[PDB]
Write a protein that binds this ligand. Structure first.
Ligand SMILES: Nc1ncnc2c1ncn2[C@@H]1O[C@H](COP(=O)(O)OP(=O)(O)OP(=O)(O)O)[C@@H](O)[C@H]1O
Ligand SMILES: [Mg+2]
Ligand SMILES: [Mg+2]
Length: 1700
RNA sequence: ACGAGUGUCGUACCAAG
RNA sequence: ACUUGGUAGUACACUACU
């Protein structure tokens, strides 16, 4: 306010450098504003200015008689008080715009002062005076106060504070860190969350164990720290300062002792030289031979690929009947004697229709038009290519031999009949990869496959990919087009396509089979056939398909045999090759079907821009990797990454990893081949450590124009013969891990493995860990005094304003609001319930197979597989549990009065003491790792308590609040680059400053990429106790309650899942050393107590904070050690959950770099160990120039990412929800790959493959059943929107910027160019849109009118519903016009309490009518889902009406949906009902895709399109958003310039993207404010939401949405004659869904791009983005007609030259 | 045979003769 | 063991971080 204060604030702003200081300045500015307003208001009220007066002082002033000890004043600290006429007024000053903080403060003060008002028999009136800073208006809630002061005027001015805040925000606007550090600074009040503490915490056995471990002074320090109150104390930091001073001596001694070790370093670290790799390999081989059964016989090999293939015959015909006759005659003529020759000959005999081909065809057609076999000549025909076994034509012994031994059908004994001798005990059998003969055989197989499959298929390439995207691919890169065409020419492509098609045909006929029948499956190849043997229905649970491949070939040895052949036999006119029978499940068949796209993607990714590589060599490896559906290759791909990276690194423990953990699993020959490849790569990795080089650095004191790694091909290729660049080397290292064959774990074994892992960790902790604290870096211990001192220092540094920190934590996480407003407490995720659930789970008696659990009554009983009923009788101490949904659990708890309308933090504090005994269960994640990770599911109450703890710990972390731990943002890729920049500059200036005097000072760049081993499983949870006691933003009662919760959490019990217990109860033989039985008291109970494991991912943020403290200690040690050498050091540490990236830049001359590297690595390990952490030797390594943070690379300043992992995943993962959904996910993945550096041609190839695979899945290819070309006014698929099963037509720049909306934008831009007058062809898009008024609607074409009608009535409006919208919320509508139905699992819904309530209300006289009218009179319950108890419970019951909502709660197994798209292509699956509503299978709909097309076209033709409609389209698709306008202008006004080579890359976000955002808030917040008609809501800034609501109201008014809704409602009411609740509710739902979709379309999540140059303006970003995506080999300088809106070498270990 | 596995599994199930 | 008849929609599946 005064001159000195304002200039001091200016000085602080100008001298501010970090975001934390800016946040402190903002807090100080807010406090100064509040103080100014309070002083001026006190002047107006003629009362003495008091601020933050303790309530006890108030009472003593008004009641001096009462002793202060007698009265227990509330722990509030009111701003002011006024006691007159026996009335006490409590006055609080507020300078906020919203009234939410005032309401919260009033409620809290009222409920905390009512007690003391009652005891003293004096009324206490709570009055909050709030001034609005922009309108200067006073708001007073109290009517008595307003009577007592009739007129209050405060003529003041807040302009100075506004300008100061504006300057501060301008200086820090482009900092994302600053924006979210001051996001929720609306101060409500400071009050404890609970009135009382937890006295029984001090008597907890866990607390007593924790206390007895520490020394007596530490016990006293902890006791006084828990009891310290930072709000009544004279200073908030007295406790922290005292404890820091106490621990300072030992902390300094530890730091000095660690730093002095630099002189004791020997310089010898763990270098990955070839001798070390050889020793590790020998130890690994010994370990594997110990743990596996090693076979040197080639007959023991498993199929590398489960297919045998041969080339087709051009002479023969591809007719099915002729192929069948040829196959029968070839099978009948098998020559020689063999085990199954008679069976095969008889099988051919019983399918030889002979001369009666016409009768066979007519019988098959008659069957198709409309089962008893029909006797064709020596054939019993049941269907097309289905034949019954003829017992007259085959001998019984041969039939049994063929069905039992060859196919494994009925050979085994049933589980009930199995004896002890029937059980097999043996180690898994794998091939000897070291054996020279085995490797030679694998090499022979690879060479033979390359010989056969390299030949041309003889057919001209013609397919969907070429016909749809060949021009774009050729324009982006002609070399990519040539490579793809050569791939299409080869026999690799024909073989893999034949395998995929034959697999689809085998699956399509796997429904109706009988034991005495077999089927023939064919493909486009006339020489390849499949015999399908009887099995269970494929749609059933865990069903398998069993088949054998037969190939006819004229010349022997022309058969493709990847270890699958059974035999080759001479037959009439050639040879017939038969493979062994193969059983596969649904997921492996899905992998086979989707293999061709993966093969193409892998081939094009590996061959991209590498003339040294040979395409045939790449294809030979890619066909084996793409068609690998077994664990053998998964056991090799992931270890290869870490092994090769660690052998490449300067220092790593790769030898120990190979010796102890690397376990190759080689059951196939390709596994032996790949193992040899990995061994050679690891051997040669350290040899080429020398051949990596650095670019010359062009820096000009303001930016570094050129940097990175030289793109010279001197490294040896890993999987192929050839040479690669370092980037290509890393790509070859990392891509094979992303050949994701997920879902290959079997629960039978993986559940036991996970249980064994958890229980073994728990046992090792139970018996081998006796001490908690240590000073010698003992494993799983913490240095107590170092931990305490570090926590004190970091808490002091991060708690500048403790009141505002507490307020921000409360505001961000909705502590003072209802539980129903938290997303994680109302979600559809799973949680656990403990209780009696016999009825839910129990849905001729059997005896258990295990002999230990059989009573004398059950001795004479049939053995059966264990179920829940059988498990109940076996276990005495069985704790019953069930899994439910989170929202259902919340509904049940609210219904049973466990949870109330109280603020959520009060309920959490209550539950921390009420809920004492915790339960968890586990399941397998199902990831592509060779060993799966376990995932723990807990209860609702555990979720509440952990929510409170994690939200407290999250604020102090440096992590971005709005991102998840599971998916780190790409912004890290930028941050790393920034760090590298400084570490380069620091290296340049320090070396030049020290060498100016000239024994020469030398530099060193060190980069530690580390992961922690068993981050949650092996941790000291006790170290977090001190984190809560020392926290200065917590009251003592809150600390006691949280510590009580943590003590109870250390006593948690893991529940073993029922499936695992079923597995263990069916064994019949005891396990020799059964850890599971030992932990469960010989299966007495299903619960095991877990003490030191905090569970997978429950404490991410707390652990991250402690990890950051450990890195701070490491930095301190390094700085002191370098100070001992009188050198310069720069340490930068990036910390994620357990991932670390530490960069060290050192300039010194005392000693050699090797000693410094050894010392730094030893100190890193010791610093991790001192805090209870251990570095993972599998993922920890040290380099000079390669930074590896979470999946992101920095190659000496150049950002880098393996973008192929985004492409491959798009092929690999499919949810099979629907055509448009799958296409949208794949296109989003392609856009993500583009942002990460994908060349344009590869992106176009990815998009083409995505479209082709989507069309294959849903029969949308040209000429197929769901082909939409004939139903719509379109000549090509390009003319149909992708939402209507069309293909995407948009420039790659548009896809990169606006992914899914690119099609509509590009169509609108094309329409503008076609109908814009010639004088305005090249102008701003605003000027061209203005002339749309001059367009003639009759001049438009049918396609243009049809697409414009879609845009007007289906995008900007809701004229036709994709599904039944009753029960849907405002966000459930998407962009999908046609949506297939999915599963609605009846078992999943029967487990929901709220679902039973919904059924009860549905079967009631008029309950649903009352619910609908309640929803209608409160329409914001459609946008929200309830903000209190009653509204949430009504909204849940209403939401149960939605069929789409019940499908979201159901199980959508991707394999079952994949076979659904194969078996039931013609089934109606679409719920399409025209314009605004004008035993059955599990999945069923109203109409099919073609019927949907016809109804959609018929209803579109009835609509009317006018000029005003086109104006509305152009105004609210393009003109509304600054981004869309910018993109349109860039496309229209683009001029490409001179070509330029791509040399260096930079990470850049679109500059000033905040000015390109129309709506600041999220769609949910905007819709909440609009539906409630209030600008200020819980998580919104009132001023910004005012203009957001202005924009939304403009959209609603100009498009006549509400007026048309009212007219429709009135017309319907007139037609019916009475008010219709359902119609009006549906109309409101449609209106809110349209508003939500508009607001969502407004926002674009532009993020970090990798671009050839740095961008400083929005135009620069657009030009770089556009010029980058034209050609692969080079990029163009792009200009716009109008506005769119001296060399020196450095003396360092990584040698480099700077051109300054 | 095939899938899985240094954990006994899948390799359809039931009834009648 | 073999013959005939009947039955069978999913891994009833999944979390902590938005
Ligand atoms: N899928 C997940 N679900 C829950 N928490 C997870 C998940 N993935 C990672 N986390 C959390 O992040 C941490 C890091 O786990 P990560 O996969 O890096 O390995 P780790 O468990 O530390 O073990 P290791 O390095 O020995 O394999 C976990 O300990 C857990 O807290
Ligand atoms: Mg880890
Ligand atoms: Mg990690």
């Amino acid at each position: 306010m005064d001159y000195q204060e304002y200039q001091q604030f200016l000085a602080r702003i100008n001298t501010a450098r970090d975001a934390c200081v800016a946040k402190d300045i903002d807090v100080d500015l807010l406090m100064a504003r509040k103080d100014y307003f309070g002083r001026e208001l006190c002047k107006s009220l003629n009362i003495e200015y008091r601020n933050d007066v303790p309530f006890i002082d108030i009472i003593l002033d008004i009641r001096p008689e009462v002793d202060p000890l007698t009265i227990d004043a509330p722990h509030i600290t009111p701003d002011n008080y006024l006691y007159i006429n026996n009335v006490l007024y409590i006055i609080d000053y507020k300078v906020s715009v919203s009234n939410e903080s005032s309401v919260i403060t009033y409620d809290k003060y009222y409920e905390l002062t009512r007690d003391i008002s009652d005891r003293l028999s004096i009324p206490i009136e709570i009055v909050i005076i709030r001034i609005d800073p922009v309108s200067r208006d006073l708001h007073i809630n109290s009517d008595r106060f307003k009577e007592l002061y009739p007129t209050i005027v405060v003529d003041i001015n807040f302009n100075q504070f506004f300008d100061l805040k504006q300057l501060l925000y301008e200086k820090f606007g482009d900092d994302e860190e600053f924006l979210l550090k001051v996001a929720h600074g609306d101060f409500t009040l400071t009050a404890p969350w609970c009135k009382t503490g937890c006295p029984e915490f001090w008597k907890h056995p866990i607390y007593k164990e924790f206390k007895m471990s520490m020394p007596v002074p530490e016990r006293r320090l902890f006791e006084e720290s828990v009891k310290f109150n930072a709000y009544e104390s004279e200073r908030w930091n007295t406790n922290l300062v005292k404890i820091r001073e106490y621990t300072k001596k030992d902390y300094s001694e530890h730091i000095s002792k660690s730093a002095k070790n630099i002189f004791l370093a020997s310089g010898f670290y763990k270098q990955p030289n070839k001798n070390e790799i050889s020793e590790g390999w020998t130890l690994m081989v010994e370990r594997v031979q110990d743990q596996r059964e090693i076979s040197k016989s080639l007959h023991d090999q498993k199929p590398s690929i489960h297919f045998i293939w041969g080339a087709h015959n051009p002479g023969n015909s591809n007719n099915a009947t002729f192929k069948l006759i040829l196959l029968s005659k070839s099978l009948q003529s098998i020559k020689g004697i063999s085990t199954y020759t008679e069976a095969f000959k008889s099988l051919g005999k019983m399918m030889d229709i002979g001369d009666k081909a016409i009768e066979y065809e007519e019988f098959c057609m008659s069957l198709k038009s409309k089962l008893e076999p029909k006797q064709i000549n020596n054939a019993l025909v049941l269907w097309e290519q289905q034949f019954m076994i003829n017992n007259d034509l085959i001998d019984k012994s041969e039939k049994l031999k063929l069905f039992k031994n060859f196919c494994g059908i009925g050979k085994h004994k049933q589980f009930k009949n199995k004896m002890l001798e029937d059980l097999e005990v043996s180690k898994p059998k794998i091939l000897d990869f070291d054996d020279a003969n085995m490797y030679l055989a694998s090499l022979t197989m690879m060479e033979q496959s390359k010989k056969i499959l390299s030949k041309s298929n003889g057919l001209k390439p013609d397919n969907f990919i070429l016909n749809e995207f060949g021009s774009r691919i050729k324009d982006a890169n002609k070399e990519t087009y040539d490579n793809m065409h050569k791939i299409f020419e080869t026999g690799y492509w024909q073989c893999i396509s034949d395998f995929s098609t034959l697999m689809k045909n085998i699956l399509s006929v796997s429904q109706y089979n009988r034991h005495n029948t077999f089927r023939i499956a064919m493909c486009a190849n006339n020489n390849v056939f499949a015999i399908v043997f009887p099995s269970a229905d494929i749609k059933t649970k865990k069903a398998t398909v069993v088949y054998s491949i037969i190939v006819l070939h004229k010349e022997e040895e022309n058969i493709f045999n990847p270890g699958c052949l059974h035999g080759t036999f001479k037959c009439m006119n050639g040879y017939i090759s038969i493979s062994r029978a193969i059983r596969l499940d649904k997921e492996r068949c899905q992998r086979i079907v989707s293999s061709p796209g993966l093969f193409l993607t892998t081939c094009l990714l590996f061959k991209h821009d590498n003339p040294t590589l040979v395409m045939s060599d790449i294809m030979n490896f890619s066909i084996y990797t793409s068609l690998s559906i077994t664990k053998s290759v998964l056991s090799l791909t992931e270890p290869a990454r870490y092994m090769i990276m660690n052998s490449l690194a300067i220092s790593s423990n790769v030898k120990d990893y190979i010796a102890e953990k690397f376990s190759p699993y080689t059951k196939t020959l390709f596994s032996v081949y790949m193992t040899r490849l990995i061994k050679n790569a690891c051997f040669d990795a350290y040899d080429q450590r020398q051949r990596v080089q650095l670019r010359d650095i062009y820096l000009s004191d303001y930016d570094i124009t050129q940097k990175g790694i030289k793109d010279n091909r001197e490294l040896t290729s890993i999987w192929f013969p050839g040479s690669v660049t370092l980037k290509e080397y890393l790509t070859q290292i990392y891509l094979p891990f992303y050949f994701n064959a997920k879902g290959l774990h079997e629960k039978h074994h993986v559940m036991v493995d996970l249980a064994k892992t958890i229980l073994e960790i728990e046992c090792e902790q139970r018996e081998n860990i006796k001490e908690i604290w240590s000073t010698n870096c003992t494993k799983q211990t913490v240095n107590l005094k170092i931990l305490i001192h570090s926590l004190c220092k970091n808490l002091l540094a991060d708690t500048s304003r403790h009141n505002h920190l507490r307020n921000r934590i409360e505001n961000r996480n909705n502590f003072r609001r209802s539980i129903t407003t938290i997303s994680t407490f109302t979600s559809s995720k799973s949680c656990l319930k403990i209780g009696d659930f016999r009825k839910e789970k129990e849905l001729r008696k059997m005896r258990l197979a295990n002999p230990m659990f059989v009573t004398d009554e059950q001795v004479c009983l049939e053995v059966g597989h264990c179920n829940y009923e059988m498990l109940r009788n076996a276990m005495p101490n069985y704790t019953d549990y069930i899994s439910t949904k989170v929202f259902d659990r919340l509904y049940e708890l609210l219904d049973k009065k466990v949870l109330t309308d109280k603020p959520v933090i009060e309920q959490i504090m209550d539950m921390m003491i009420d809920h004492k005994k915790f339960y968890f269960t586990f399941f397998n994640k199902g990831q592509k790792t060779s060993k799966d990770r376990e995932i723990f599911v807990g209860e609702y109450e555990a979720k509440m308590c952990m929510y409170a703890v994690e939200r407290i710990a999250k604020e102090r972390c440096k992590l971005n609040p709005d991102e998840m731990i599971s998916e780190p943002g790409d912004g890290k890729l930028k941050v790393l680059e920034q760090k590298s920049e400084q570490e380069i500059r620091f290296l340049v200036e320090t070396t030049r400053q020290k060498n100016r005097e000239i024994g020469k000072a030398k530099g060193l760049k060190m980069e530690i990429n580390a992961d922690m081993s068993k981050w949650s499983a092996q941790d000291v949870f006790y170290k977090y106790f001190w984190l809560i006691a020392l926290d200065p933003i917590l009251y003592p009662q809150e600390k006691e309650r949280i510590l009580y919760f943590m003590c109870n959490y250390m006593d948690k019990e893991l529940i073993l899942p029922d499936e695992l217990l079923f597995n263990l109860l069916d064994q019949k033989v005891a396990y020799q050393n059964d850890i599971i039985a030992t932990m469960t008291n010989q299966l007495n109970s299903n619960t095991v107590l877990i003490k030191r494991n905090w569970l997978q991912g429950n404490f991410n943020y707390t652990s991250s904070y402690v990890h950051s403290c450990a890195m701070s200690v490491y930095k301190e040690i390094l700085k002191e050690a370098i100070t001992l050498l009188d050198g310069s050091i720069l340490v930068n540490s990036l910390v994620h959950s357990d991932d670390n990236q530490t960069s060290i830049t050192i300039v010194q001359d005392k000693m050699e770099n090797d000693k410094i590297i050894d010392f730094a690595m030893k100190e890193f390990e010791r610093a991790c160990l001192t805090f209870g952490c251990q570095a993972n030797m599998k993922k920890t390594y040290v380099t000079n120039c390669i930074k590896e943070f979470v999946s992101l690379f920095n190659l000496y300043g150049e950002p880098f990412s393996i973008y192929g992992r985004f492409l491959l995943t798009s092929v690999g993962d499919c949810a099979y929800i629907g055509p448009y959904e799958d296409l949208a996910s794949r296109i989003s993945s392609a856009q993500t790959a583009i942002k990460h550096g994908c060349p344009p041609s590869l992106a176009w190839v990815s998009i083409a493959i995505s479209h082709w695979m989507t069309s294959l899945t849903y029969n949308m290819l040209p000429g197929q059943s769901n082909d939409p070309i004939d139903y719509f006014p379109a000549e090509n698929r390009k003319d149909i929107p992708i939402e209507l099963n069309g293909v995407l037509d948009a420039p790659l720049s548009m896809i990169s910027t606006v992914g899914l909306e690119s099609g509509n934008l590009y169509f609108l831009i094309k329409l503008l160019s076609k109908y814009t007058p010639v004088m305005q062809k090249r102008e701003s898009v605003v000027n061209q849109i203005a002339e749309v008024k001059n367009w003639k609607v009759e001049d438009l074409t049918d396609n243009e009118i049809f697409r414009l009608k879609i845009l007007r009535y289906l995008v900007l409006d809701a004229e036709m519903d994709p599904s039944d919208i009753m029960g849907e919320t405002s966000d459930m509508r998407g962009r999908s016009i046609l949506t297939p139905r999915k599963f609605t699992t009846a078992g999943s819904l029967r487990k929901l309490y709220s679902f039973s309530k919904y059924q009860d209300r549905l079967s009631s006289p008029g309950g649903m009518v009352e619910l609908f009218t309640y929803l209608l009179e409160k329409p914001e319950l459609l946008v929200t889902k309830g903000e209190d108890m009653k509204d949430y419970m009504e909204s849940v019951i209403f939401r149960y009406n939605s069929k789409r909502f019940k499908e979201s709660l159901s199980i959508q197994n991707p394999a079952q949906l994949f076979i659904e798209q194969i078996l039931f292509s013609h089934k109606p699956v679409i719920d399409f009902s025209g314009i605004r509503d004008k035993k059955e299978p599990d999945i069923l709909g109203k109409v099919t895709f073609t019927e949907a097309y016809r109804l959609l076209m018929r209803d579109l033709s009835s609509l009317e399109l006018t000029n005003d409609d086109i104006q509305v389209i152009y105004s609210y698709i393009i003109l509304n958003d600054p981004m869309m306008i910018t993109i349109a202008n860039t496309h229209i006004l683009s001029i490409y310039g001179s070509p330029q080579r791509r040399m260096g890359m930079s990470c850049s976000t679109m500059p000033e993207f905040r000015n390109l955002k129309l709506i600041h808030h999220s769609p949910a917040l905007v819709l909440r404010a609009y539906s409630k008609n209030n600008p200020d809501i819980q998580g919104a800034d009132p001023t910004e939401m005012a203009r957001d609501l202005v924009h939304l109201k403009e959209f609603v008014e100009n498009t006549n949405l509400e007026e048309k809704m009212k007219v429709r409602i009135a017309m319907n009411e007139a037609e019916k004659g009475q008010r219709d609740i359902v119609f009006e509710l549906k109309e409101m739902t449609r209106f809110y869904q349209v508003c939500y979709e508009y607001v969502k379309s407004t926002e674009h999540k532009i993020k970090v791009f990798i671009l050839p140059a740095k961008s400083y303006t929005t135009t620069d970003f657009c030009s770089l983005m556009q010029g980058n995506l034209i050609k692969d080999k080079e990029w163009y300088t792009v200009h716009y007609l109008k506005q769119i809106l001296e060399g020196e070498a450095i003396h360092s270990t990584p040698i480099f030259n700077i051109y300054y």
